[PDB]
Structure 1
C-alpha cells in the first residue's frame, strides 16, 4: 500500500538529482513541468501525504487543521503554475521581447509565490500535528527553496534591484537551516514514538524509518545544492544511506513468535564504509507437514559477502545468520551485477496446534552495466514452493515508469540477513538496499562540481570510524578523534589532460584544525580550518561548515588521503564530504 506517494517521493528526488547546483535553462523548465504533474497537479497528492503518516502513526490530523492545510495548498498550486508558465515563456522567448513591462509581470508572479510560501508554512506545522504533517511540510519546504534559488539565476534579467536579489538570498539561507532542522527534529520524535518490544513494533518502526527516508530525508539532503552561488555549476552527487525493506514472512500474524525488537534492531548493519553485494550462500531446511503431503523446504539461514568501495579488493564475509543447512547449500554470485529487484514465494504448514511458514523461493533481477544486459538468478528450496507473496517493487518503486525497470530502478540489493523466530519456529529474512545514484568508480567529473562522501573511502586509519549521520547529509559520516591520517579514498579522473581542481570540505570540528591532502602518499594541499562546534554539542544544520583549500591541483594519482592535526584530548572532527571544483 501507499506505493503512490512512495513513487512520487522517489521520483522527485531522482529528478532533482539532475537539476542540482546551477542548472541549464532547458533542464530547469523540463524539471518544472514534471514537478507540476507529479507534486502540484491537484489536492490528491497532498491528501495522500497526510494519510501516509496517519497510517504510519495510527493517528489522525484534526479535520480543521487538515482542511486549512489543503486550502493553503490549492492557493500555492495556482501560484506555482502561474509562475512556471511565465518562466517557460521567458526561457523560450529571445532576448529581444524582454521589455520592462514583461519583466514586471514575471517579477510580481515570483514575489507572489515566494511570499505565499512563507505565509503558509506554519499551517503544515501546527502544534500537536508536526509529525503527521511531515511529508507535506517537507514537500512544501522543498518547493519554496527550489523556487527561491531562481531569483539568483534570473534576478537581474527580470530587472530586480540588487537589494531584492540579496534579500531573497538571505531568506534562502535562513530557511534552508530552519526547514532542515524542523524535519530532522520531528522525524526523530516520530521514530522514538514507535520504538517497542515486539516484532510487530519493529516492523512499524522500520516502515516509518524507510518511508520517511524516501519522502523526507533524501529530499532535505538536496537543499544546500540549491545555492547556485556556492554551486555555480551542475553538481554530481549521491545518496549513501541504507534502507531496509519489510521482513519477508508467510503469515500476517505470528502469534508471538516474531523475533523481538531488540533482537532485530541491535543486529542490523551498523554504520560502515560503503560496499556492494558480492555473494549469497543460501541454507535450506526441511519443514515436515503434519500429513507429510504438506511439507516444504525453506530458507533457514545465510552468509553474505560484500566487496568494498573501489580501491580495495578484499572481500568481506559476514558471520553466519540463522540456521545451518539440512539440505544442499545454494550459492549465487553477483560480481559486477546490480540487483534491482527481488520477488519471493512463501509457504505454510498448518499443524494441529502450530503453524510453520517460510521463504521457499527468491528470484533476483540483475543488470550488467558493462555488457548493458539484464537477467535473473533464483534461489529455490526445491520442495513445495507455494506462491509469490513479497515483491521489492512494492516498497522500492522505480524512479521512472517511463523506461524499462533495468534502467529506471531506484535501489539495488546490498545486504541479506536471516533472523530466527522465537522458540525457533522459523526464519525471517531481512533485505538492505542502497540508492541507484551511488557511483562505484568515485569519478571526478571535469565539467561539474563533484561531491565525494567520505563513507566511499576503502580504508580508515589512526582510529577514525564511521558514525551515524545527522539525518540531513544523505548518509553516514566519519568521526576523527586523533591527530594523523584518517581516510584513504580511491578517485577516478574522467579526463586524460592536466585538468586543475579546487577542493572544498564539508566538516564539523570542536577546534581549529589542519586538513592535509595527499595523492598516492605525497602531500599537495594543507590548510587551516575553523572550529564549528563546542565539545559535546549535538549535530544540527549549523554545526557543519563548507570551506575551500587555497591552492589548485591536478589529479596526478588515485589514492586521496585526508589527514587531520591540531586535535587536543577530547576534540572531535566529523567529515561528511570532499568536493572537487574544475578550475582553469
Structure 2
C-alpha cells in the first residue's frame, strides 16, 4: 500500500537531482511540467500524503485542520500553475518581446505565489498535528524554496529592483534553515513515538523511518543546492543513506515469535564507510511437515561480503547470521552487477499446535552498466517453494515508469542479514538498500560543481569514525577527535588536461581549525577555518559551515587526504562533504 505517494516522493527527488544548482532554462521548464503533473495536479496527492502518515502513526488529523490545509493547497496550486505558464512563455520568447508590461505580469505572478506560500505554511504545522502534516509540509516547503531561487536567476530580466532580489535571497536563507530544522525535529518526535519492544513495533518503526526518508529526508537534503549564488553551475551530488525494506515473512501474525525490537535494531548495520554488495552465501534448512507431504526447505542463515569504495580492493566479510546450513550451501556473486530488484517466495507448514514459515526462493534482478545488460540470479531452497509474497518494487518503486526497470530503478541491494525468531521457530531476512545516485568512481566533473561525501572514503585514520548523520545531509558524517590525518578518498578526474579547481568544505567544529589537503601523500592546500559550534551542542542546520580554500589546484593524483589540526582535548570536528569547483 501507499506505493503511489512513495513513487511520487522518489520521482521528485530523482528529477530534482537533475536541476540542482544553477540549471539551464530548458531543463528548469521541463522539470516544472513534470512537477506540476506529479505533485501539483489536484488535491489527490495532498490527501494521500496526509493519509500516509496517519497510517504510519495510527492517528488522524482533525477534520477542520485537514480541510483548511486542503483549501490552502487548492489556492497554492493555481499560483504555481499561473506562474509556470508565464515562466514557460518567458524562456521560449525572444529577448525582443520583453517589454515593461510583460515583465510586470511575471513579477506579480511570482510575488503572489511566494507570498501565498509564507502565509499558508503555518496551516501544515498546527499544534498537535506536526508529525501527521510532515510529508505535506515537506512537499510545500520544497516548492516554496524551489520557487524562491527563480528570483536570483530571472530577477533582473523581469525588471525587479536590486532591493527586491536581495529581500528574496535573505528570505530564502532563513527559510532553508527553518524548514530543514522543522522537518528533522518532528521526524525524530515521530520516530521515538514508535519505539517498542515487539517485533511488530520494529516493523512499524522501520516503515516510518524508511517512508519518511524517501518523502521527507531525501528532499530536505537538496534545499541548500537551490542557492544559485553559492552554486552558480549545475551540481553533481548523491544520497548515501541506507534504507531497510520490510522483513520477509511468510505469515501476517507471528503469534509472539517475532524477533524482539532490540534484537533487530541493535544488530542492523551501524554508521559505516560506503560499500557495495559483493557476495552472498545462502544457508538452507529442512522444515518437516507434520504429514511429510507438506515439508519445505528454507533460507536459514547467511554470510555477506561487500567491497569498499573505489581505492581499496580488500573485501569485507560479515559474521555469520542465523542458522548453519543442513543443506548444500548456495553462493551468488555480484562483482560489477547492480541488484535493482528482489522478489521472494515464502511457504508455511501448519502443525497441530504450531506454524512454521520461511523464505524458500529469492530472484535477484541485476544490471551490468559496463556490458549494458540485465539478467537474474536466484536462490532456490529446492523443496516446496510455494508462491511469491514479497517484491522490493512495492517498497522501493522506480524513479521513472517511463524507462525499463534496469534503467529507471531508484535503489540497489547493499546488505542482507538473517535474524532468528524466538523459540527456534525460523528465520527472518532483512535487506538494506542504497540510492542509485551513488557514483562508484567518485568522478570529478569538469563542467559542474562536484559534491563528494566523506563516507565515500576508503580509509579512515587517527581515530576518525563514521557517525550518524544529523538527518539533513542525505547520509552519515565523519567525526574527528584527534589532530592528524582523518580520511583518504580516491578521486577520478573526468578529463585528461590540466583543469584547475577550487575546493570547498562542509563541516562543523568546536574550535578554529586547520584543514590540510594532500594528493598521493603530498600537501597542496592548507587553510584556516572558523569554529561553528560549542562543545556538547547538538547538530542543527546552522551548526555547519561551507568554506573555500584560497588557492586553486590540479588533480595530479587520485588519493585525496584531508587532515585536521588545532584541536584541543575535548574538541570535535564533523566533516560532511568536500566540493570541487571547476576554475580557469
Encode CA deviations 1:316-347: one digit per residue, 9 max, x unaligned.
Answer: 00000000000000000000000000000000
- Taking the aligned partners of 1:266 and 1:330, their CA distance within structure 2 comes to 28
Encode CA deviations 1:431-482: one digit per residue, 9 max, x unaligned.
Answer: 0000000000000000000000000000000000000000000000000000
- Taking the aligned partners of 2:424 and 2:443, their CA distance within structure 1 comes to 47
- Taking the aligned partners of 1:182 and 1:168, their CA distance within structure 2 comes to 21
The Cα of 1:91 is off from its aligned counterpart by: 0.1
The Cα of 1:397 is off from its aligned counterpart by: 0.0
The Cα of 1:424 is off from its aligned counterpart by: 1.3
Secondary structure of 2:336's partner? coil
Secondary structure of 2:432's partner? strand
Secondary structure of 1:45's partner? helix
- Taking the aligned partners of 1:300 and 1:395, their CA distance within structure 2 comes to 24
Secondary structure of 1:13's partner? helix
Secondary structure of 1:374's partner? strand
Secondary structure of 1:216's partner? helix
Secondary structure of 1:165's partner? helix
The Cα of 1:54 is off from its aligned counterpart by: 0.1
Encode CA deviations 1:4-52: one digit per residue, 9 max, x unaligned.
Answer: 0000000000000000000000000000000000000000000000000
- Taking the aligned partners of 1:424 and 1:568, their CA distance within structure 2 comes to 51
Encode CA deviations 1:245-286: one digit per residue, 9 max, x unaligned.
Answer: 000000000000000000000000000000000000000000
The Cα of 1:200 is off from its aligned counterpart by: 0.0
- Taking the aligned partners of 2:421 and 2:288, their CA distance within structure 1 comes to 17
The Cα of 1:202 is off from its aligned counterpart by: 0.1
Secondary structure of 1:471's partner? coil
- Taking the aligned partners of 1:454 and 1:336, their CA distance within structure 2 comes to 23
The Cα of 1:241 is off from its aligned counterpart by: 0.0
The Cα of 1:498 is off from its aligned counterpart by: 0.1
- Taking the aligned partners of 1:140 and 1:431, their CA distance within structure 2 comes to 32
The Cα of 1:186 is off from its aligned counterpart by: 0.1
- Taking the aligned partners of 2:254 and 2:298, their CA distance within structure 1 comes to 17
- Taking the aligned partners of 2:85 and 2:326, their CA distance within structure 1 comes to 65
- Taking the aligned partners of 2:322 and 2:455, their CA distance within structure 1 comes to 29
The Cα of 1:412 is off from its aligned counterpart by: 0.1
The Cα of 1:151 is off from its aligned counterpart by: 0.1
The Cα of 1:360 is off from its aligned counterpart by: 0.0
- Taking the aligned partners of 2:202 and 2:34, their CA distance within structure 1 comes to 36
The structure 1 segments of at least 4 consecutive aligned residues displaced by more than 4 Å after TM superposition are: none
Secondary structure of 1:450's partner? strand
- Taking the aligned partners of 2:225 and 2:269, their CA distance within structure 1 comes to 29
- Taking the aligned partners of 2:423 and 2:560, their CA distance within structure 1 comes to 50
- Taking the aligned partners of 1:272 and 1:554, their CA distance within structure 2 comes to 30
Encode CA deviations 1:542-584: one digit per residue, 9 max, x unaligned.
Answer: 0000000000000000000000000000000000000000000
Secondary structure of 1:53's partner? helix
Tell me the residue number matched to 1:285.
285
After TM superposition, the score normalised by the length of structure 1 is 1.00
Secondary structure of 1:59's partner? coil
Secondary structure of 1:482's partner? coil
Q: Where do 5+ consecutive residues of structure 1 fail to align?
A: none
Tell me the residue number matched to 2:136.
136
Does residue 1:565 correspond to 2:565, yes or no? yes
Encode CA deviations 1:331-367: one digit per residue, 9 max, x unaligned.
Answer: 0000000000000000000000000000000000000
Encode CA deviations 1:79-131: one digit per residue, 9 max, x unaligned.
Answer: 00000000000000000000000000000000000000000000000000000
- Taking the aligned partners of 2:353 and 2:481, their CA distance within structure 1 comes to 56
After TM superposition, the score normalised by the length of structure 2 is 1.00
- Taking the aligned partners of 2:52 and 2:476, their CA distance within structure 1 comes to 26
Does residue 1:410 correspond to 2:413, yes or no? no
- Taking the aligned partners of 1:321 and 1:185, their CA distance within structure 2 comes to 35
The Cα of 1:204 is off from its aligned counterpart by: 0.1
The Cα of 1:311 is off from its aligned counterpart by: 0.1
Secondary structure of 1:217's partner? helix
- Taking the aligned partners of 1:464 and 1:39, their CA distance within structure 2 comes to 41
Secondary structure of 1:298's partner? strand
Secondary structure of 2:536's partner? coil
- Taking the aligned partners of 2:375 and 2:512, their CA distance within structure 1 comes to 53
- Taking the aligned partners of 1:487 and 1:556, their CA distance within structure 2 comes to 18
Tell me the residue number matched to 1:332.
332
Secondary structure of 1:469's partner? coil
Secondary structure of 1:118's partner? helix
Encode CA deviations 1:285-330: one digit per residue, 9 max, x unaligned.
Answer: 0000000000000000000000000000000000000000000000
The Cα of 1:157 is off from its aligned counterpart by: 0.1
Number of corresponding residues: 584
The Cα of 1:240 is off from its aligned counterpart by: 0.1
Encode CA deviations 1:215-246: one digit per residue, 9 max, x unaligned.
Answer: 00000000000000000000000000000000
- Taking the aligned partners of 1:346 and 1:362, their CA distance within structure 2 comes to 9
Tell me the residue number matched to 2:362.
362
Secondary structure of 2:206's partner? helix
Encode CA deviations 1:487-544: one digit per residue, 9 max, x unaligned.
Answer: 0000000000000000000000000000000000000000000000000000000000
- Taking the aligned partners of 2:61 and 2:98, their CA distance within structure 1 comes to 47
- Taking the aligned partners of 1:97 and 1:304, their CA distance within structure 2 comes to 63
The Cα of 1:70 is off from its aligned counterpart by: 0.1
- Taking the aligned partners of 2:293 and 2:45, their CA distance within structure 1 comes to 49
Tell me the residue number matched to 2:344.
344
Secondary structure of 1:299's partner? strand
- Taking the aligned partners of 1:386 and 1:484, their CA distance within structure 2 comes to 57
- Taking the aligned partners of 1:205 and 1:510, their CA distance within structure 2 comes to 33
- Taking the aligned partners of 2:423 and 2:159, their CA distance within structure 1 comes to 73
Secondary structure of 2:182's partner? helix
- Taking the aligned partners of 1:525 and 1:475, their CA distance within structure 2 comes to 26
Secondary structure of 1:71's partner? helix
Tell me the residue number matched to 2:471.
471
Secondary structure of 2:578's partner? strand
